[PDB]
Design a protein around this ligand. Structure first.
Ligand SMILES: [Cl-]
Ligand SMILES: [Cl-]
Ligand SMILES: [Cl-]
Ligand SMILES: [Cl-]
Ligand SMILES: [Cl-]
Ligand SMILES: [Cl-]
Ligand SMILES: [Cl-]
Ligand SMILES: [Cl-]
Ligand SMILES: [Cl-]
Ligand SMILES: [Cl-]
Ligand SMILES: [Cl-]
Ligand SMILES: [Cl-]
Ligand SMILES: [Cl-]
Ligand SMILES: [Cl-]
Ligand SMILES: [Cl-]
Ligand SMILES: [Cl-]
Ligand SMILES: [Cl-]
Ligand SMILES: [Cl-]
Ligand SMILES: [Mn+2]
Ligand SMILES: [Mn+2]
Ligand SMILES: [Mn+2]
Ligand SMILES: [Mn+2]
Ligand SMILES: [Mn+2]
Ligand SMILES: [Mn+2]
Ligand SMILES: [Mn+2]
Ligand SMILES: [Mn+2]
Ligand SMILES: [Mn+2]
Ligand SMILES: [Mn+2]
Ligand SMILES: [Mn+2]
Ligand SMILES: [Mn+2]
Ligand SMILES: [Mn+2]
Ligand SMILES: [Mn+2]
Ligand SMILES: [Mn+2]
Ligand SMILES: [Mn+2]
Ligand SMILES: [Mn+2]
Ligand SMILES: [Mn+2]
Ligand SMILES: [Mn+2]
Ligand SMILES: [Mn+2]
Ligand SMILES: [Mn+2]
Ligand SMILES: [Mn+2]
Ligand SMILES: [Mn+2]
Ligand SMILES: [Mn+2]
Ligand SMILES: [Mn+2]
Ligand SMILES: [Mn+2]
Ligand SMILES: [Mn+2]
Ligand code: NA
Ligand code: NA
Ligand code: NA
Ligand code: NA
Ligand code: NA
Ligand code: NA
Ligand code: NA
Ligand code: NA
Ligand code: NA
Ligand code: NA
Ligand code: NA
Ligand code: NA
Lengths: 175, 175, 175, 175, 175, 175
């Protein structure tokens, strides 16, 4: 099942991302259930917003919000919920929400899957519009959900993203 | 796997529905295989009709047709086949088909997933058009499939829906 | 052409709405060109937001922003850009943007097209979630477009919507 | 505009069909307005049914229902509302509805557009399932619209379809 | 999981096909992972081409390319990735790629799922256009992927397809 | 109508492109009819290929193939057939087909519509993958259409694209 997918072939540079929400999809917030490995509806989002990239997590990790670390994966075409993509981290949006510190990694499809994103080496190679759109999404998508909120801290580089991946892998290993 | 999903957090008021067919989808009748938990094609429907709501079942139940009890789930956006949604029963369309008594529960997304359907407390709060469309669908969707047929009995309330859920849970428990 | 469509069969209660942007569509802001009647791309929106209803205008009207008065039309299924729907006004979101006062009418499909929205007689019959989502959209969709902005004033009733329709028809008549 | 499209290059064998409703689309019944040439919503259909083929009309014709003669066009991929396709008639479903005699021609894409349908020479070359699905659609799609109804008479051949095209062209010519 | 699905109810005439890629989908080459049973992205295809039919494999088989034998399944509507369809083989496109001999079976939905394809008894009953399109796809879809290539050998009949199914089942059984 | 749209606000740097075929669409080759301004189906393409960008033309121009000069427009989301987008030329794929010399301009959305493509100043700023995909499409999409063919000459810069625009505008002006 999806429960058994590795964190990656060679963390933190070579990871697998389990996709929960496709890019430019309807505002249904799916989450994989850790007991069954099935995709559950967590929420029907209240704002008229969509995830700007495919969205999911790295298996066998844990953020301080109590769930595996979150990842945004840009692709040329939207991915299937429940599918897995091999990726390379390139940056991170540091942020906190009501459940705890809750960074959003950005990881691009691995070179073996496409050459498309090879030119994206670090956070400044991501389009500025995309980074602005991602930060705006996380700042506002909970605006009509009472008691849910976000504080965006800022964009950091690939090295910061890789440190976040290591920390989150250790957290899962360790409790 | 989907085979392991509970019937619900607190049956019969708080249930989980495994989705097989999205709302306003192509006429492919998928069914979860009980041995493997995979989605199989049961039929390519012959009529030019679509399921009026997302369609699926409550795990760990059994109707007299030999399959888990059936559920229609209205949502603002179609659900993914194989996904699970927490719901609250609000009514039932009693009917029989060639395989046996085969009620169609209507359950709305639980308040925790959205406030959208909180105002739907009982069957008379469902839109009349929707209930008419559901009954018409089940009356006609087998019209071009020889030896398959339906007899619709009528709409009943939330309390009837909850009794159906209990009965179907017991049937699975019991044989 | 679309240039020749009446404002309505019986303004202000019975109107036609020319659709520019479908509900739950990609963020491409189309506008009908008044010289040619063709649909032009005005903008690729920068935020990850979508119009919560079909969006367009009443022909042969003018708002203070210099364009025909704007309308949101809820429907069960998204409409085609460039299509026309007969509608009945039920409420208005008063607001201003960088181009001038720029109210957003809400008009539902006319009874002749469907009975679905007959129960929506006035603004308080619109779902609260929908009204919240519409106001949030207009408050934020220009957040990443420099020099574009909105000030939302508030929701008003059907009678206010009808007065806005009359005023906007007169403005076009008159200059 | 669409108002100016010929009935065909060489009626009745070589026709143009103006498309109003795509195949396997949402149940929005669009109709071209004869004054403006714009696509108007005639109805949001009440049944959970979809047109089994692209649906539209031959310009410069008239059926006894007061509108141009109706055509179903099978294609490998759905057509755009408001687009025009060159076709060849292969059969007709004779029927009446509340507005008058109202045959449904079946015309396939002309050989110049594709070789796909060349093998369809006459009505018996259409798939039986498709013909059954079309007849079932027209028998039932008005089932929840009070005062709207259909009586299906039966399938007839290409020669009957061509006679219907001639008759309908003459009717428009003549009153 | 999908790992546990039989090759078929009665190989080689009555098989199950696990679907990885829907018909007329975006060019994302998904493959089921044999360890986890999850759908992984193998590649984002570089050419502007799409699989002409649903595409997948027969479980518990092995081709000389090291993966389960490949199958194309025509259907009236695209299938879900990860779903299973009961099918009947009707022909095979013999070909080799960089990974080894790599035939492409064509199998149609079993009569129990639909009567639509009953008339397809053998390879010459498949539309010529479809067979041409399939061969052209496999000849060209790797044209922009360095070191990936195909040599198409030619179309063969149902009996050849069934022999391929038997051989591939034995290969898996046997090493 | 679309017949009346200018070639551009300031040719050759500031153009309007009438869209006939959306990006990543079904293989239906639409063309605007010069007499009526309606979208006609020219062909159902025989290969399993899709246009890699939105595709259309500059009004009031003529290529040697007898039709207005062709344009590919990359966008973040596919455009509507029959819509118009303001664009800036950045490069050209020189090629010939059976109808004559038939260059394919590449023009990006104008800065006024989005800042997304501002960084694309000339042909070498287009992604290499995209340019490879476009050339491969035009080399192969007619492979199964007898008597239709293409010879691709090669990619040239923005200045070459602008000269092509001027030449094609003059050709229309002049005969
Ligand atoms: Cl791991
Ligand atoms: Cl979050
Ligand atoms: Cl930012
Ligand atoms: Cl349980
Ligand atoms: Cl049933
Ligand atoms: Cl009813
Ligand atoms: Cl008027
Ligand atoms: Cl606005
Ligand atoms: Cl509000
Ligand atoms: Cl004519
Ligand atoms: Cl009718
Ligand atoms: Cl029939
Ligand atoms: Cl087996
Ligand atoms: Cl292959
Ligand atoms: Cl072939
Ligand atoms: Cl001009
Ligand atoms: Cl060409
Ligand atoms: Cl190239
Ligand atoms: Mn969307
Ligand atoms: Mn969560
Ligand atoms: Mn998460
Ligand atoms: Mn969070
Ligand atoms: Mn999180
Ligand atoms: Mn069943
Ligand atoms: Mn069931
Ligand atoms: Mn049943
Ligand atoms: Mn049942
Ligand atoms: Mn404007
Ligand atoms: Mn407007
Ligand atoms: Mn405005
Ligand atoms: Mn306005
Ligand atoms: Mn549909
Ligand atoms: Mn009519
Ligand atoms: Mn008609
Ligand atoms: Mn009629
Ligand atoms: Mn008619
Ligand atoms: Mn496609
Ligand atoms: Mn492979
Ligand atoms: Mn394979
Ligand atoms: Mn291969
Ligand atoms: Mn293979
Ligand atoms: Mn042409
Ligand atoms: Mn052209
Ligand atoms: Mn050409
Ligand atoms: Mn050309
Ligand atoms: Na979407
Ligand atoms: Na909140
Ligand atoms: Na649908
Ligand atoms: Na039947
Ligand atoms: Na959408
Ligand atoms: Na702004
Ligand atoms: Na559809
Ligand atoms: Na009726
Ligand atoms: Na597609
Ligand atoms: Na290659
Ligand atoms: Na597509
Ligand atoms: Na050719």
């Amino acid at each position: 099942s999806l429960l058994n997918v590795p964190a990656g072939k060679d963390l933190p540079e070579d990871i697998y991302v389990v996709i929960e929400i496709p890019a430019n999809a309807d505002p249904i917030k799916y989450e994989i259930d850790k007991e069954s490995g099935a995709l559950f509806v967590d929420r029907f989002m209240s704002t008229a917003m969509f995830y700007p990239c495919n969205y999911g997590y790295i298996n066998h990790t844990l953020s301080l919000d109590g769930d595996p670390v979150d990842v945004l994966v840009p692709t040329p075409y939207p991915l299937q919920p429940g599918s897995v993509t091999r990726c390379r981290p390139v940056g991170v949006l540091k942020m906190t929400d009501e459940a705890g510190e809750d960074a959003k990694l950005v990881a691009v499809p691995h070179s073996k899957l496409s050459k498309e994103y090879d030119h994206i080496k670090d956070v400044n190679d991501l389009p500025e519009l995309l980074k602005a759109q991602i930060a705006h999404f996380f700042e506002h998508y909970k605006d009509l959900e009472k008691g849910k909120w976000v504080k965006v801290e800022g964009w950091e580089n690939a090295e910061a993203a890789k440190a976040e991946i290591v920390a989150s892998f250790e957290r899962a290993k360790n409790k």
